[PDB]
Amino acid sequence: KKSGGSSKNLGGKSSGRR
Amino acid sequence: GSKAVTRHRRVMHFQRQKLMAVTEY
Amino acid sequence: RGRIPGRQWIGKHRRPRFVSLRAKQNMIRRLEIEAENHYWLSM
Amino acid sequence: VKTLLPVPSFEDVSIPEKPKLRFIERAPLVPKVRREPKNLSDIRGPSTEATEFTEGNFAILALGGGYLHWGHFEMMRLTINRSMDPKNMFAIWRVPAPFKPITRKSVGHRMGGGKGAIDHYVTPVKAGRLVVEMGGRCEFEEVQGFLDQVAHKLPFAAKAVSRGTLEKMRKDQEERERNNQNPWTFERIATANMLGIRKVLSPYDLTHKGKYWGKFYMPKRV
Amino acid sequence: KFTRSRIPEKVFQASPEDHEKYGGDPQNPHKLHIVTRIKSTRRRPYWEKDIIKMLGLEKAHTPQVHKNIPSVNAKLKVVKHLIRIKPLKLPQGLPAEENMSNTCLKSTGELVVQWHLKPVEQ
Amino acid sequence: FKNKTVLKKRCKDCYLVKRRGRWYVYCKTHPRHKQRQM
Amino acid sequence: AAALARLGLRPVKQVRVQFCPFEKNVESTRTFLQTVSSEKVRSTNLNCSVIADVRHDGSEPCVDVLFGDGHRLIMRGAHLTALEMLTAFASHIRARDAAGS
RNA sequence: CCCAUAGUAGGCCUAAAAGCAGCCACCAAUUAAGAAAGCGUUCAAGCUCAACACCCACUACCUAAAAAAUCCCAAACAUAUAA
């Protein structure tokens, strides 16, 4: 019912470099 | 499950409960 | 009367288990063995 | 002939200019924007700060971990400043003002949608820490009454102490560890991983030695 | 996280009051072990299950003999809670070629080279 | 009376007494000091 | 004195205490006199007299109580405590007072 | 349990402030008793505590509760040598 806000943080999806 | 720190006293594993009973002053 | 909410031995509110006397003795018997194992692993 | 005894003299003691407890603000001077994790291990285990007396002689000892918000500080302040004699007593804070932000989501919302907004601030406290320290031209029996009254209203197990009772408390626990007739202890078993017991233990139990379970402290455990 | 355990070295340091309790001799240490599994590997980590196979302790209550040397002892310190360690005693000495088929391992840890199965005349 | 989990005397004429398996506080001077253990 | 003052020496007419101080059995009788001779008890009935006659005849101590009704109460204190003597003394006060009224 | 007299209603403030609204001092009589620790009085009176005397109160100062809806819930047991 009551709608909620979204997260404002984007990115941070980089994978490890090994 | 439950976090390691809780407002309520958290029930122990039976093996730990036995350990605490053997190691009593 | 006497309901444990949910399943007995899991979760937040569990059925309490108490340590009997032979359960203590059984654990102490194991300890005395492993304590002597430390002695023979030392020479 | 009832035998009379000498009495201690506090003439050598000095009283500051503001003996009463200063006011504590709800939130810090500058509001924080970066939201923090729960980090529950700030109230877990023994304290490594404010475990000894600095100026006073009587205090409130924490026997457990917890968080203090503004409501707790006002109760301590008013209750102490009202019940104490400003001329012959003084009190100080041994805990900083609320700085850890506590977020909270709005009512009626489902799981997800990011993290909540900062609602209030708290002060983490560990077991073995002094919360309030008092002193002056007074015995312990005078302050012990209203200090325990305060200690009972705190969110954790607390108790009023003095330089003597605290020392005695610690020496009695050491005596218990030495004269314990039980050959089996939590430390010996855990450190050696006897019975494979470290499969049901925690790495912190190597240092806490069974005296702590979450935020709760057990003084009867050796 | 649950991990492998590092046992301190002070644990394996016999005290003077321990030698007058178990009957050992620090100057004349025993040469061989008598290890016997008395606990299940189930509900234990896989690295404990593998050590039990290397030591030939699959079947329980089955004495196996190993050498009392650091490398072997190290493997035993990882599963020291699943086994029973006892020194091998040789009251008659090492078995000779003519005694290999007359031996018997008793519960005392002694290896007798003359298993006659007859009441003692004494 | 008044059910109390922590009994406490409110004057010099209050007296503790154990009756019917529980502790009471009686007072003849001020009958409002009467308490029952809960 | 407190317990005996709430009651009062209303029916009493005279009280007489005789004892031998040097004798070693007069502690009870001398303690009885210490309370009855108090300002609290004596005030309740000014008319009621209280007499102490010391003697050195090697005789036993006695407490003789004269009442208005005419009845008498005698307590030989050699083997009686002050509390026993006082208790009996009070009980008679209550009985004799009710009889008169 | 027992018992309580006195410089004095200390000084100042106050309409009044007398041990006890506040500020200052907190000395002194008597074998012994605070220029008063707690009630109380409009202010006073008045009741206790700390004192002497009497002689053994010759204590603990470590914890205080509980209630839901078909019908409580194995039966029982404190004393014959740890198997």
Next chain:
RNA sequence: CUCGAUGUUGGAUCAGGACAUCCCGAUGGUGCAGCCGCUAUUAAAGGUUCGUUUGUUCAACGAUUAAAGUCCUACGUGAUCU
């Protein structure tokens, strides 16, 4: 858990149960004179109204009553109804 179906509001019918008691009973305290009340302990045997508007549960209002109780029972009960 159930979508190769566990029919969902309120009401009618019949009610079963808890007591955290609305009335009736027995007690303690009161800033209880008495008459009325406030508060707490104990008590669940018995009882707990009829009407106007609203689909209503509630609510408001009218007239009464010793009192017009709070809840659970698949928000009791549709192979009994509406």
Next chain:
RNA sequence: UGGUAUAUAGUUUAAACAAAACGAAUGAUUUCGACUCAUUAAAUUAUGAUAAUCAUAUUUACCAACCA
């Protein structure tokens, strides 16, 4: 029941250390008045804490709601 706003001279109304406005008084002005100008009097819902800012309960306003 719920939260959200709420309060300033006698009233009316910006703002809290108290500003202006109606009315009141006062003079100045006119033959006398009205208007106008000038002057004067006049207040912060009250309770507890920060020391004048958050709380506290009121106060009236303001929207919310059995259910299928």
